[PDB]
Amino acid sequence: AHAFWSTQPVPQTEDETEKIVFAGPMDEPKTVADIPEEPYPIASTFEWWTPNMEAADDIHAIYELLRDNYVEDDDSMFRFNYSEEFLQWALCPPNYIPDWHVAVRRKADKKLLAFIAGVPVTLRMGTPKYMKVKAQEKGEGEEAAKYDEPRHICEINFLCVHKQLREKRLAPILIKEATRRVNRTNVWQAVYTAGVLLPTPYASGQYFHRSLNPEKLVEIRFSGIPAQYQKFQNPMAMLKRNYQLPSAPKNSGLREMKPSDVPQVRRILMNYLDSFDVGPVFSDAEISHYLLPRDGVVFTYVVENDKKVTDFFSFYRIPSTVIGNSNYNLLNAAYVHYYAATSIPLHQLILDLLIVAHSRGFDVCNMVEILDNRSFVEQLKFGAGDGHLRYYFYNWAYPKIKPSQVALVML
Ligand SMILES: CCCCCCCCCCCCCC(=O)SCCNC(=O)CCNC(=O)[C@H](O)C(C)(C)COP(=O)(O)OP(=O)(O)OC[C@H]1O[C@@H](n2cnc3c(N)ncnc32)[C@H](O)[C@@H]1OP(=O)(O)O
Numbered sequence: 001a002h003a004f005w006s007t008q009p010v011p012q013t014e015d016e017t018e019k020i021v022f023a024g025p026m027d028e029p030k031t032v033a034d035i036p037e038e039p040y041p042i043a044s045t046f047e048w049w050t051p052n053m054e055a056a057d058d059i060h061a062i063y064e065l066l067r068d069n070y071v072e073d074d075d076s077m078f079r080f081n082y083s084e085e086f087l088q089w090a091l092c093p094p095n096y097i098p099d100w101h102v103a104v105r106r107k108a109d110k111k112l113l114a115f116i117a118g119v120p121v122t123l124r125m126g127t128p129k130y131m132k133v134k135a136q137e138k139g140e141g142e143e144a145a146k147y148d149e150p151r152h153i154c155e156i157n158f159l160c161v162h163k164q165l166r167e168k169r170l171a172p173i174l175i176k177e178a179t180r181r182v183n184r185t186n187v188w189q190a191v192y193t194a195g196v197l198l199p200t201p202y203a204s205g206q207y208f209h210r211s212l213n214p215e216k217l218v219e220i221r222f223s224g225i226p227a228q229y230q231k232f233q234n235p236m237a238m239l240k241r242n243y244q245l246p247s248a249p250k251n252s253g254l255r256e257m258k259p260s261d262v263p264q265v266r267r268i269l270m271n272y273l274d275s276f277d278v279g280p281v282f283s284d285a286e287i288s289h290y291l292l293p294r295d296g297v298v299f300t301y302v303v304e305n306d307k308k309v310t311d312f313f314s315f316y317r318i319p320s321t322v323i324g325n326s327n328y329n330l331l332n333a334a335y336v337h338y339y340a341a342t343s344i345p346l347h348q349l350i351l352d353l354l355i356v357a358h359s360r361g362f363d364v365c366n367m368v369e370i371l372d373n374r375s376f377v378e379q380l381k382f383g384a385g386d387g388h389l390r391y392y393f394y395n396w397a398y399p400k401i402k403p404s405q406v407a408l409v410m411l
């Protein structure tokens with residue numbers, strides 16, 4: 001069972017999710033006035049803390065907590081090491097709410113013990129196309145279209161409890177307090193991803209990886225040398241050859257995105273994303289924030305030929321600590337972010353992403369099978385990884401959809 005999740009406005013089982021036919025809320029309507037004004041009760045030795053995520057020292061404290069306590073694989077080989085600059089970027093988008101960044105510290109020594117972050121997002125989350133068809137076939141179109149308008153909701157990320165405080169039911173308390181602060185802002189839905197199975201995902205997708213520095217990936221045991229390679233006199237030489245990339249981009253007119261590109265990038269991105277069942281809606285300010293290049297954080301390139309931007313891609317950087325190998329500090333990973341192609345095939349656009357990532361010293365390129373990411377898996381030599389990324393809503397009934405109908409990239 002789920003002692004915490006069984007108390008929450010989420011579908012409880014897979015059989016439950018398969019009965020859902022229209023998008024809409026689970027909970028009864030509430031007002032801000034109904035929500036307790038005071039923070040959720042916590043042990044007298046602990047205190048709630050709202051970090052100022054634009055203050056270098058507060059960012060650093062969050063950085064340390066995550067560096068030492070955030071997502072690790074089951075074999076404790078790698079742990080995310082989100083940079084301070086990345087954290088400021090991720091947590092402070094346009095119109096962010098400082099109160100949605102929630103921490104727990106120990107009163108006695110002020111040691112940070114836990115964290116959860118919420119940021120605003122405008123999300124299309126109305127009934128999916130295939131279910132709208134079923135609704136039309138049943139004469140149920142009005143119900144199905146009720147929540148079509150993009151919604152201003154909360155995106156939750158960076159949930160983390162210190163290793164010393166694991167399995168003490170602190171995570172539920174963090175979630176309840178985050179929910180309270182978000183509710184007090186008159187927001188009633190959230191979206192989040194997890195690599196674990198909880199009640200109850202609306203979409204699940206496999207991870208994919210594209211080796212850029214195969215020798216390093218083998219050394220740190222991220223990858224193995226596949227059995228067939230042992231038929232070669234020099235397995236490693238053949239592995240390096242198979243994953244080799246051009247030393248410079250192949251698309252003429254590829255350049256870094258500039259501020260003047262924001263309107264055209266917004267247009268082509270929004271045109272593209274609107275085709276998916278679940279996707280964000282971005283203002284000029286949000287395009288600028290999430291896509292303009294930021295050193296060591298986000299990398300974005302446009303294709304400009306005949307003086308017009310026709311295509312773009314973006315990727316972001318999350319290095320992981322290489323826990324057990326003493327020869328390497330970090331695994332430098334590039335993550336496929338947003339993109340749009342109108343003039344060239346997607347594989348041709350994303351080949352340039354791999355080329356740029358490789359030339360900038362990235363070891364691997366990662367993605368989930370959302371958007372049209374499946375369309376270039378085979379040609380660009382991506383391989384499926386371990387497990388799945390699952391997408392969830394809080395207080396939103398939603399029918400199961402394919403990951404190829406999801407257009408929300410999570411950081
Ligand atoms: C309207 C606004 C709403 C806003 C809120 C929306 C909801 C947001 C939801 C959060 C979205 C987060 C998105 C991300 O950031 S996903 C990334 C989560 N972080 C990590 O994996 C970092 C390393 N691990 C940890 O820090 C801890 O192990 C965590 C914090 C994960 C659990 O701490 P701990 O190990 O010390 O356990 P506990 O005794 O305190 O708590 C046990 C309960 O917690 C449930 N649990 C375990 N893992 C997750 C998980 N990943 N999402 C949601 N729930 C999770 C579990 O089923 C159990 O409940 P139940 O089975 O008894 O019922």
Ligand SMILES: Nc1ccccc1N1CCNCC1
Nearest residue numbers: 193207335366367368410411
């Ligand atoms: N986005 C993504 C693609 C491949 C593997 C992992 C990820 N994520 C998902 C969001 N959390 C950070 C890492």
